[PDB]
Design a protein around this ligand. Sequence first.
Ligand SMILES: Oc1ccc(/C=C\c2cc(O)cc(O)c2)cc1
Ligand SMILES: Oc1ccc(/C=C\c2cc(O)cc(O)c2)cc1
Ligand SMILES: [Cl-]
Ligand SMILES: [Cl-]
Lengths: 330, 330
Amino acid sequence: APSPEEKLHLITRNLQEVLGEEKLKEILKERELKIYWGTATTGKPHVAYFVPMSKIADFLKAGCEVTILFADLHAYLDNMKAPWELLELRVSYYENVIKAMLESIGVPLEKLKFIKGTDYQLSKEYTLDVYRLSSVVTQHDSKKAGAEVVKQVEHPLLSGLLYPGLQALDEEYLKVDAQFGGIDQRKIFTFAEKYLPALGYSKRVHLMNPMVPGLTGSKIDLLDRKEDVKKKLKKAFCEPGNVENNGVLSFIKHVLFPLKSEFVILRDEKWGGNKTYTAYVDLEKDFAAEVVHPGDLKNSVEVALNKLLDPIREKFNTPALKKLASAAYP
Amino acid sequence: APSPEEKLHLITRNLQEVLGEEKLKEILKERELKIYWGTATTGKPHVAYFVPMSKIADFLKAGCEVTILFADLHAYLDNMKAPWELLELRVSYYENVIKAMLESIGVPLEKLKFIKGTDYQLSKEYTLDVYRLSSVVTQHDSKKAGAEVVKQVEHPLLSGLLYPGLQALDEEYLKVDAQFGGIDQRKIFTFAEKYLPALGYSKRVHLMNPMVPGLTGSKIDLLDRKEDVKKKLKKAFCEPGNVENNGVLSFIKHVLFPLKSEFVILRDEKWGGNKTYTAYVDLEKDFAAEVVHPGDLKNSVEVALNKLLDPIREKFNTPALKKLASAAYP
Ligand SMILES: Oc1ccc(/C=C\c2cc(O)cc(O)c2)cc1
Ligand SMILES: Oc1ccc(/C=C\c2cc(O)cc(O)c2)cc1
Ligand SMILES: [Cl-]
Ligand SMILES: [Cl-]
């Protein structure tokens, strides 16, 4: 209440791929799943962050124990002439904004934990494991693991070969059963499943979201005012009838629909009035049939997106949080 | 008493190359040089270890502060199915044998220090520096740095790309002015001179010994009995008249001659009787002229080598040290 079958459904809905279904069902028969998701604390997050956060809300509703890793070491390793002070302010900005997002969605936070990479990634046991891994992984396997996640420059840096191992070790040191991310990370994830056992650690379940087209094609910032949300959405590409490549519809599929397993299309009387959909495939079929117009779909998103963003804007309107946003992103 | 000019002469004699003469002379004008030499604690050491130890004795006689690094992390990273226990016993075997060698040579140990890599190489500040370096060094520069020191296998391991950085950081963390090793390591040393400044650390002086041909061509072990020393030397290649490629003469040049800036060739009356040389070039010239025969040169080495080894054999004949040698090398 929820059953193991209900838990699995919530945990795995809207994913592109599940690695490790067997172990996943074994766990869910007995106890709550332990899972993490990592984000590097570089770049101001924008509305597209709702796509991962929606899965994090599903994990929490399931009853999972959920860790969010703020990967501040990776952030330092992009810009070392950026002070630890600016970096850690970006860490708090991320922490506050993630919390505000999950609060806006409305999800129990009792089993949520926040951890920074530097809390453990420079400890002696972890470091030693980094060296052990390095003496079993080839440069070739490391390079191929990082290809879709580490920016292939002119002469590549040594740091890029280390990322797949550090991310694998994260699964162990965070003591999780599973890691969630994007399908982009698949090669990092299979690298972890391959090499953790060589250090005597268990392979993890890997849950992968699809790559989802952006809402807007000046991305919508989590703190943008209503007026700028409107302006930015009216600019967004929606092609009539197009359901395969539609960032407005993907936002509904991955963020708005799962809120309540409901979505309301706002439509004038002339075209039939509002309609409430209880499965996404029904919206998709009306959109493909062109009885939901792009402008009405954008509208229905604008309203629901604004309702999501309002509590975050209010929370971040305190002097303490206003000062943080200004100092994190100067 | 000794002057800076005397110190430099002792420090730098018998080297193939000095990098950083300018800073070296600046230091020696003011204070004692701080220097280290590292050895990985894999493989039982043999008589060829006298070649580095002779330079270490010169540094000590100079008045230098000398650190010897026992690189036990590198040793672990060759064989991780070798227990930490066996590894640390090899560390003590190395420590005891190095000390015994330096005692046999007869050198003040007041400014000698022994340190193991694991005393500092897993600390948080060092590890962080390893990551900083990794975000400025290319894989290409790392690979080329390690070429003559890391065994070029089928698909290379990630661990081999890390070695040049860890060795560079050693210079900083051991707080030395200089590192001594073989000319083989030159690329590692120029890598350190190039990349330490990118972490805000000073470049070091680098003192490099030549590659010296082996005494024996069943190497002579530091604890081999007299009888086996004899047997092994009688087997060694000495070509009459050959001075450029002569491991018996290189042992004299790099180890025996520097003991007292003297060497005694033992020769029958018939061929002129013994002769005492006060410069190596005079021995070399008599050898090239074939008035010192290979068999007499081997003899003179056998005697002097046995005198070196006797105190080590006696020291290692204690039950405590006999048990160590057996357990270190089972
Ligand atoms: O365990 C972790 C999970 C997620 C992240 C986040 C992103 C990330 C960024 C990189 O530049 C390299 C990498 O491997 C991952 C980092 C660690
Ligand atoms: O600072 C140090 C100085 C010397 C040593 C010894 C040898 C060594 C062995 C390796 O396999 C890699 C390397 O870089 C060095 C190790 C560290
Ligand atoms: Cl999809
Ligand atoms: Cl020489």
